[PDB]
Amino acid sequence: HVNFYRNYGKTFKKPRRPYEKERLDAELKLVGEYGLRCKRELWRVQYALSRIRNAARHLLTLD
Amino acid sequence: GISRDSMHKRRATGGKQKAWRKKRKYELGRQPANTKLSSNKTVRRVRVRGGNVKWRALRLDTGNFSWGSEAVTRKTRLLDVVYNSSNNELVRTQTLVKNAIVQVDAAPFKQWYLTHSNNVQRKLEKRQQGRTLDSHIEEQFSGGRLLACISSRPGQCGRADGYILEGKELEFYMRKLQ
């Protein structure tokens, strides 16, 4: 059954420590300023940003 | 049925080798021919892998025997097996089987050696100046029946072929037979 072979993955990962005032307020700041539908929307951005930053870091390790 | 797979054998260390396939055809064996030496020549077809043919020689009396020293290869009639280095049971039951010692006519060979006006003797005298004829192959013609070694695979190719013994091999087999 081809149409099986079509890849797909995720776009985010939930934060480790679910309940912190500091992280929770930072998330509410960002969601309030940029008018988001939920914090899944915020959580995608960190996933994409972490991917690119890790891409940069692996480069900067080399010469 | 019969098989040539190594599944049934034991590993080198000896541990039992579990069977993990059911037997496949490309590992088939077939019951031997025990080629007899008889008058009633009957060699029969078998259809083997690839669709080609193998001629199982169940029983023969007429074969093709070479003479290397003289480079003469005559058809002749099988008399009898006299020695086999694998199984005396095969001597007793008269199985034409590769690298046996059969005894053959010397009938085509005697008249060929009888072969070999002026143009004829002018060639005959060119020969007869190099005739060798070892005394040990010489006495065998007087006996009228020659030690020859079968060297075909009768059960495989449907022929009994071979070569007359001479030199070290003849003296050795003859010494075994006395």
Binding site: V2, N3, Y5, R6 | -
Partner: protein, 261 residues
Amino acid sequence: ARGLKKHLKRLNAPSHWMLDKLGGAFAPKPSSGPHKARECLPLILILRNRLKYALTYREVQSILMQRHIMVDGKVRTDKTYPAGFMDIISIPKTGENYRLLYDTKGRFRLHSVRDEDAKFKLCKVRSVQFGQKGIPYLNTYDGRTIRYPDPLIKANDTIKLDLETNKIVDFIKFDVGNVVMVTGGRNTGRVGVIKNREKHKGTFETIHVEDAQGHQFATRLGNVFTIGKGTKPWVSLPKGKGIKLTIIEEQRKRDAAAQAA
């Protein structure tokens, strides 16, 4: 299994066929032919995928049994024919010739030719040795066989075969200093002039090559295919003259392409 496997599913179809992943389960499975079915290109992939002369399986079937398509100069009704390196495809309805050549990335291109540079093809010899009654003959990698070969022609050499007299017209002795066009491995596509050939007892003999613009590589004797004696090849090389260039340069060329547009 208990016999020949006659389906080839799409993801097993070799990398250089370029065919997409989700267009279906299966792949054309080249018939047992003149080329090794791993180093080939079927006629359907020629018509449908590249030239777009058809849009389906059946439409290529229509193309082929119109008797329009020609391979090595003789019409071919097969639809998974394993064409290969320097097979010529002519379409006399279009008066148009292709010769099937690699590029430096390892994929097939259809390099056009005129008629004078289409009357013949070019292929190497697998082996030259005797046959019935002691007549020499040679066997190519193209399947082709030649009887009474020119007694100088050895193994590994290359020959030109006219498509009318159907025999040799010339042969290039595989040697140091003449150009090749490697046809397998990572270096396939890259033309270049041998600078050395080292042999090892019991295994593959390798050839060191240089791209005429400097870069140097090596490949075992299997995939070399001498084209021309000396530096000049006897075949019209593709759009990029057999030079594999770094990905950095493939960036600079596209920058330079857009900055003049």
